[PDB]
Structure formats: C-alpha cells, structure tokens
Design an enzyme around this catalytic site. Structure first.
Site, PDB file in Angstrom:
ATOM      1  N   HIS A 170      35.032  43.797  43.360  1.00 20.07           N
ATOM      2  CA  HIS A 170      35.577  44.988  44.213  1.00 20.07           C
ATOM      3  C   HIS A 170      36.150  46.392  43.728  1.00 20.07           C
ATOM      4  CE1 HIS A 170      34.972  42.974  48.451  1.00 20.07           C
ATOM      5  NE2 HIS A 170      35.190  41.991  47.720  1.00 20.07           N
ATOM      6  N   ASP A 203      30.372  39.199  50.046  1.00 18.29           N
ATOM      7  CA  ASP A 203      30.491  39.180  48.316  1.00 18.29           C
ATOM      8  C   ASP A 203      28.929  38.582  47.857  1.00 18.29           C
ATOM      9  OD1 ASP A 203      32.730  40.021  48.171  1.00 18.29           O
ATOM     10  OD2 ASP A 203      33.884  38.244  47.704  1.00 18.29           O
ATOM     11  N   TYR A 208      48.826  40.258  45.673  1.00 18.10           N
ATOM     12  CA  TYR A 208      48.734  41.537  44.705  1.00 18.10           C
ATOM     13  C   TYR A 208      49.148  42.762  45.643  1.00 18.10           C
ATOM     14  CZ  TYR A 208      43.724  42.212  46.955  1.00 18.10           C
ATOM     15  OH  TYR A 208      42.982  42.142  47.698  1.00 18.10           O
ATOM     16  N   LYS A 219      45.551  47.837  41.707  1.00 20.31           N
ATOM     17  CA  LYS A 219      46.115  46.493  41.851  1.00 20.31           C
ATOM     18  C   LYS A 219      46.889  45.766  40.732  1.00 20.31           C
ATOM     19  CE  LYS A 219      41.579  46.244  44.653  1.00 20.31           C
ATOM     20  NZ  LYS A 219      40.247  45.579  44.344  1.00 20.31           N
TER      21      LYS A 219
END
Lengths: 199, 199
Positions: free
Chosen positions: A62, A171, A132, A72
């Site tokens: 991503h 995905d 995260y 992130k």
C-alpha cells in the site's frame, strides 16, 4: 532505542529499551524526543490501526499519494510478521528496491515508513496483532495498491507451511508496478524530500 | 463505534467497529474524526507506552500536574485488565469518585482519560498487554501517584479472589489522597476545564 535506517532510505528499524521486572515488562513504543531524532520532525498521529492475522495472510502493498501521503509507525504486539518496505519514489537511486524487518512479541521492534513509500506484511503465526500509527487519516480516494508478488519487485516473501499467501480481494487484484508507474500515480523522489524538507 | 462518557466526566469508554473476515480482523483504534467527536479536539500524541503484566499486577494510581497534564487513550491487545479512572479535580461535583472499564482482546474497548484525572489498571490474566497514547511525554517531575487502595477512594479492585495484588516500589509507597490533597498537588476542576474548553 537504536534506530537503524534500512536499505530503502526513509524507512527505519526501531528497537526499544525494554525494562523488565517482577510485574512483567514495559517500554516506550514512541516518544517525541526519540522519533524527532531519526525522522527529523515530530509524528502527528491522525489515525491508529490494528489488525489480527492468522498464519499466512498478506496485507499490502500500500501507498498514499504524496500531498499528504501517509507515514506509518508499525509494530507487532502478539505473534510475528515479516514486514516489507518498497521504494516507489521514481527518480530515487534505490527506486524498485525493498527491505524487510521482523516484527514480533519477543524483540518488539518497529518499522517507521515515511511518506510516499509502499508497505506490507505477512503474518507468520496465528493471532498476529499489528498496530500502527499513521500521519494521515485513511483516504480511499488517495490510497493505492501494488500487487505484493509483482515480478519486477520480486519481494522474497517467506511462506508458512510451504503454503501460498491468503490475501483480501482488493490486494489480490492489485495492479502491477509498471501498470502503476505508467499510470503516473507513483510519488516522485524530489517532491517527497521537499515535503519532508519541511520540518 | 460507541463513545460513552463515564460517571466521571471527562473520561470515556470507546467500543470500536470490528471488521471480521477470513484473514482475521481489523479496526480503527483511533481516528481524528472519531476522537474529535467526543473529546471536542484532536489528540496530540507525544508519547505511546506499552506494558505486559502477569495476573494480579496493579499499576497506578497515576496523574500529571496541570499545565499540561497527560491525557491517556488506553487499550488491551492481549489478555484483560480492569481499568480505573478517579476524579481528583478539586471542586468537581464528582470529586473523589471513580469508574472502571474492562479492557480485553475480546471486545477491544478503550478508555480515554482527560487531563487532570488519575488512572490505573489491574491485570486479570497472564500476558496482558496494555498500550496507551499520551498527550505529553513522560515527565518524572510532574507525575504523581495516589495509593491505589486508598481508603477514601475505596476503589473496588476485583481479585480479593485469591491474592493481594502485585505492585512496584513507587506505587506501593504512594501517598494517600488526603496526603496529596492537603499538599496542594491536585488539579482544580475549574482550571482543567479552562485548559480543555480552550480546544
């Protein structure tokens, strides 16, 4: 506390100082003073996500388009994941390169993945929890995917019981890197650095 | 989601929307849009802490001195803890009152604790991991403690079903709550609200 820049510049492996006592253990996952040291600015956390994965499941790869993009700060708090960063910033001298870090509940590392890079992870164990921090709120309109097993990136994913990965629908249908490159959606090296060049 | 103000004003129980699929599960632990809704401003995350505790281990009660004190967004990602907030704000109509929320890896709730309140939790299981976001970096000089079993607070800790609880030296020697009030280290209701109602 050692932050170790990965072979992709702008991505770091962080190892914490773990205080252990009779009660169990504690640590600072993030501190402003500590993060500022290596990232050169403070993280403004606008979202925090959590997931739990069974053995063999892959989430990624991503990225968020650069005007904001989405940095992130990523850790495993149960089980283990093989986490991967990819340099999708055309113009960069490590363009097309990737590196990994192992996140588990034994060493308790973290990877920081700055703006305009691609990120993903493979769980290696049942009940693998990944948490995260994110610098931008999730935005469907500016989030994109590159197929995790793309042959140009040729990420060396491990496999669980010699079993192929379990992914989500989106995905699994993700476009290829030269499909995303040609479509003009990748960040530029120069413009990520100028956006980070703020401080 | 669901954010539910506790019986102590300025503290909230948060339940997430949990997306479950074949990979396991995921949720937004925090979003700016969602936090602002109930807190009325954005969480400035300047530190995130992590601990893992064995059965019977008690950490608290803790508070930070105002300007700018330390708000806490707190969750359990493995096992379970009984989490307590106490209203230590002199002048408050709920002065000396407490409430609890149950944090675990089943329902995955969170308690948000605003500036000027006291906070603690008891682990109810082996391998109880607690993570929490903080609006201020740890500052030893402005963090104070109130004994968790103070007879004036009379918090109802759940495991006089076996053993006395396990604490650290500093929490074990914590001053009682008339010790702390007469020494003038408690926040004042009027001035916590002026700090917060400022957004």
């Amino acid at each position: 506390m050692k932050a170790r820049e990965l072979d992709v510049p702008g991505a770091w492996e962080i190892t914490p100082t773990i205080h252990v006592d009779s009660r169990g253990l504690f640590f600072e996952w993030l501190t402003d003073h500590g993060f500022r040291a290596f990232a050169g600015h403070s993280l403004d956390v606008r979202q925090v996500n959590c997931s739990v994965s069974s053995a063999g499941v892959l989430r990624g790869l991503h990225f968020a388009q650069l005007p904001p993009s989405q940095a992130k700060y990523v850790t495993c708090v149960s089980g283990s994941v093989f986490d991967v960063v990819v340099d999708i910033r055309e113009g960069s001298p490590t363009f097309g390169r990737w590196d990994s870090v192992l996140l588990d509940d034994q060493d308790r590392r973290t990877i920081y993945v700055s703006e305009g890079l691609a990120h993903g992870f493979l769980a290696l164990q049942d009940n693998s929890t990944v948490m995260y921090l994110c610098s931008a709120e999730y935005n469907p309109q500016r989030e994109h995917t590159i197929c995790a097993t793309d042959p140009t990136l040729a990420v060396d994913w491990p496999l669980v019981d010699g079993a192929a990965p379990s992914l989500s629908d989106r995905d699994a249908a993700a476009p290829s890197f030269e499909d995303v490159r040609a479509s003009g959606l990748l960040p530029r090296w120069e413009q990520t650095q100028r956006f980070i060049g703020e401080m």
